[PDB]
Design a protein around this ligand. Structure first.
Ligand SMILES: Nc1nc2c(c(=O)[nH]1)N[C@H]1C(S)=C(S)[C@@H](COP(=O)(O)OP(=O)(O)OC[C@H]3O[C@@H](n4cnc5c(=O)[nH]c(N)nc54)[C@H](O)[C@@H]3O)O[C@H]1N2
Ligand SMILES: Nc1nc2c(c(=O)[nH]1)N[C@H]1C(S)=C(S)[C@@H](COP(=O)(O)OP(=O)(O)OC[C@H]3O[C@@H](n4cnc5c(=O)[nH]c(N)nc54)[C@H](O)[C@@H]3O)O[C@H]1N2
Ligand SMILES: [Mo]
Ligand SMILES: [O]
Length: 771
């Protein structure tokens, strides 16, 4: 009559209370250091009226499958169909593309975060089906570190951003200063790719409790800065390279840089110093020069230099500052600065590029790691067609176009079919109006979705998918500690006519005659036992005993491992520092590449051989009369991107039923805007409505609109107005540079005005037309 079921999500292990077959409460299965409200809305996710309840097809698509008026996408009426008919239609439409163009005509990169779980990984299951039927065009990189993950291999010989960090125990014991540079961990570590072990936030609180210095360098006084009682250094968005250069110049000018470290562990510093001192362009990159650009007073720049060089300092760089034009320069320069400080490889010293993401630094436990489903079941030349994924709109609009990327050339393919399963590009991709046009080009657009997202509303065929709570699965506490195996026990039966993505793709696999290769003859629970036994065997090899799967599953509790002393004491780059000749980096020199011949020899206009300041098209430094404010689009506290936007958590932040925009009181007063007013934000790309949140917690001249609000266009006969405040309606869709071609949202300027009139009803969380 009343039971508690343990399952999990990106936002942690979750206990779910079921009362007479209905979910009535959800919360942490393991008490966290800071409450995580994301864990409390399982019932909202299960029973929401925004859920896709039945297979649906666009009316105009039904009239002429694969030959419709595609300008009707997003505008049409929806027809309920049976699963039989929808699956026959999907199979037929994909087969037509394969028959006429082959695998290069299908895009199934399907970027998204979907839900955690080893088996029910909607994106992987889609790609497993696509590969079982001949292949598909995928993508390269990701939206999180599109720039940093390309430049760091050139500088450090490794991807760096998704690797274990120096142990938090070492930071607690030895760091005098931690600098949160474009990092908001008390927001961004409420989730992990698997399931957050919740220990990263705890360690930040332990460091706060030590009383040692925490510095936040950010255009906003973030949730982290406020909750950790930290020192706020306001900085203009996209001006961190000038600030780092000013700090670097001060170090040289005062003889505080570590010349011994630079000599032994880096390559090309001299070429960089010539630029730093103004010997190549005639402009020394002084603190006074930097202050004009980044808004940090020159004397504050100098004191940071002195404090960093005299105290054991860990530079924790987040990723907002590389999600922008020339983003490659920021973490390149951060590494360069850390090299000049000379503390890389010391306890509590150096830099880290994942202390803000998925609990980096939490000591790695000794245990086992479960398996998971792959896209490889057991003529396809799509590898050459993969492109940097943020070029998606460019690809759909310009088939055959060639671009430069990381020293090579890529030719866009000719995409006829788009299948998304577990992502929301009409919220996550930049310049939404251009994406609308791009999605008119494919012959067929298919979406598996839990809810009626803006992406589903732009499709031809929408298939209802289940949540994690309607199926069984396994995940880990992570993403680096690997300290627990979390069970994901089914809480309720599938709702409405929703199906697990697994079952959707089994049915399509049957229609193509590849069911056996897809399922491998296994049931849901047989898949999970196999994944579990992979961890069982690895734990055994590590001298750790685990219960049998059936015992583990019956207990329905997290199974946790312990970290040993080696993990608790581990220092990143410690071996390199001990002996760089015997422990070289995977770079051409074997050292830190402050100057990279490889990058220089590419001869790109927007990326030189060493870190440099290159003014972007739009930022605080070149706002105009027409667009006098700069924009930054940080990640939200009460959503995972667009996930949970439809839940009761919306009431915790919506202002006048719009996404809130942080605006400085001086910029608000100049516009007659008071707290709580609906405002109109517009750029050269589009216009959205938001709710004014007037606050000194944002640097003057800049406004912050969090990413992830559901695009809700108001069609009034054109770049229609978003009624809800989707940030990417406003952003530029362009590569960071020819090196990485990452996405560049956070270099943007806008205008804001008080909205006069009656506020449009927000309709994007309700069933669409003709359900
Ligand atoms: N202006 C700006 N834009 C940005 C960013 C920014 O910082 N500023 N950040 C970028 C980055 S780092 C990210 S990773 C992206 C996020 O981009 P997305 O990953 O697309 O955002 P999500 O809201 O997580 O979308 C996940 C979708 O998967 C669905 N889903 C969940 N579980 C399942 C399932 O089991 N089956 C199926 N079929 N669907 C499921 C959810 O309903 C949800 O719609 O945004 C990027 N865009
Ligand atoms: N609750 C929640 N947690 C999450 C996510 C979520 O959507 N919701 N997204 C997850 C995923 S997919 C990702 S990739 C990571 C994102 O990890 P991050 O990229 O670090 O998340 P952002 O909010 O974009 O972090 C940028 C922070 O630095 C600021 N900032 C932005 N641009 C600049 C700049 O140019 N210079 C300086 N000095 N500061 C800048 C932002 O205001 C913001 O406070 O977080 C993950 N964790
Ligand atoms: Mo991300
Ligand atoms: O990501």
């Amino acid at each position: 009559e009343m039971k508690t079921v343990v399952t999990a999500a990106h936002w942690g292990s979750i206990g779910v209370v079921v009362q007479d077959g209905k979910v009535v409460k959800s919360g942490p299965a393991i008490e966290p250091a800071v409450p995580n409200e994301l864990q409390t809305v399982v019932a909202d996710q299960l029973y929401s009226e925004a859920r896709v309840k039945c297979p649906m097809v666009r009316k105009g698509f039904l009239a002429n499958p694969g030959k419709s008026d595609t300008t009707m996408r997003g505008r049409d009426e929806w027809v309920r169909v049976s699963w039989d008919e929808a699956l026959d239609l999907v199979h037929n439409q994909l087969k037509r593309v394969r028959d006429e163009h082959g695998s290069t005509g299908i895009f199934a990169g399907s970027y998204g975060w979907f839900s955690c779980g080893s088996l029910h990984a909607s994106r992987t299951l889609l790609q497993r089906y696509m590969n079982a039927t001949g292949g598909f065009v995928g993508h390269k990189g990701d939206y999180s570190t599109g720039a940093a993950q390309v430049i760091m291999p050139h500088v450090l010989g490794t991807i760096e951003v998704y690797e274990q960090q120096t142990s938090w125990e070492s930071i607690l014991e030895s760091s005098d200063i931690i600098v949160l540079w474009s990092a908001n961990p008390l927001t961004t570590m409420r989730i992990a790719w698997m399931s957050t072990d919740q220990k990263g936030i705890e360690y930040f609180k332990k460091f706060q409790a030590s009383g040692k210095r925490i510095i936040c360098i950010d255009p906003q006084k973030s949730e982290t800065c406020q909750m950790l009682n930290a020192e706020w250094i306001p900085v203009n968005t996209a001006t961190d390279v000038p600030l780092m250069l000013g700090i670097a110049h001060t170090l040289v000018e005062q003889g505080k840089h570590d010349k011994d470290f630079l000599k032994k562990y880096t390559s090309g510093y001299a070429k960089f110093e010539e630029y730093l001192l103004g010997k190549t362009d005639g402009q020394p990159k002084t603190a006074e020069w930097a202050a004009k650009i980044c808004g940090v007073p020159a004397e504050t720049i100098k004191q940071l230099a002195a404090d960093f060089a005299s105290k054991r300092t860990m530079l924790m760089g987040g990723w907002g500052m590389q999600r922008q034009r020339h983003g490659e320069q920021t973490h390149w320069m951060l590494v360069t600065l850390a090299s000049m400080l000379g503390q890389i490889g010391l306890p509590g010293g150096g830099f880290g590029l994942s202390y803000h993401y998925s609990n980096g630094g939490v000591p790695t436990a000794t245990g086992g790691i479960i398996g998971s489903i792959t896209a490889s079941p057991s003529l396809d030349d799509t590898s050459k067609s993969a492109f940097p994924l943020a070029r998606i709109a460019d690809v759909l609009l310009h088939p055959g176009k060639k671009i430069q990327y990381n020293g090579t050339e890529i030719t866009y393919p000719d995409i006829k079919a788009v299948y998304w399963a577990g992502g929301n590009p009409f919220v996550h991709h930049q310049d939404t109006n251009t994406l609308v046009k791009a999605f008119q080009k494919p012959d067929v657009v298919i979406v598996n979705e839990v809810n009626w997202t803006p992406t589903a509303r732009m499709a031809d065929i929408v298939l209802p998918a289940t949540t994690s709570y309607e199926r069984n699965d396994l995940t880990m506490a992570g993403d680096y500690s690997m300290m627990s195996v979390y069970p994901m026990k089914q809480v309720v039966p599938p709702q409405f006519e929703a199906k697990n993505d697994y079952d959707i793709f089994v049915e399509l696999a049957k229609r193509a005659g590849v069911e056996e290769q897809y399922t491998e003859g296994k049931t849901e629970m047989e898949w999970l036992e196999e994944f579990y036994n992979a961890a069982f065997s690895a734990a055994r090899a590590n001298r750790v005993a685990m219960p049998r799967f059936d015992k583990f599953w019956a207990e329905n509790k997290p199974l946790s491992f312990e970290a040993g002393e080696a993990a608790k004491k581990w220092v990143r780059y410690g071996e390199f520092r001990e002996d760089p000749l015997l422990n070289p980096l995977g770079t051409p020199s074997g050292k830190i590449e402050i100057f990279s011949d490889v990058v220089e020899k590419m001869n790109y206009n927007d990326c030189k051989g060493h870190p440099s300041w290159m003014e972007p098209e739009e930022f605080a430094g070149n706002v105009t009369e027409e667009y006098p404010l700069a924009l930054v689009t940080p990640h939200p506290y009460y959503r995972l991107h667009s996930q949970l936007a439809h839940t009761s958590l919306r009431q915790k932040y919506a202002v006048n039923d719009r996404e809130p925009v942080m605006i400085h009181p001086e910029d608000a007063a100049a516009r007659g805007i008071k707290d709580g007013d609906i405002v109109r934000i517009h750029s050269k790309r589009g216009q959205v409505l938001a709710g004014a949140a007037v606050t000194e917690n944002i640097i003057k001249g800049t406004v912050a609109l969090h990413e992830g609000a559901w695009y809700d266009p108001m069609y009034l006969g054109e770049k229609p107005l978003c009624k809800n405040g989707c940030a990417n309606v406003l952003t530029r869709d362009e590569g960071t540079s020819k090196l990485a071609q990452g996405n560049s949202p956070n270099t943007c300027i806008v205008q804001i005005e008080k909205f006069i009139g009656v506020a449009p009803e927000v309709t994007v969380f309700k069933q669409p037309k003709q359900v």
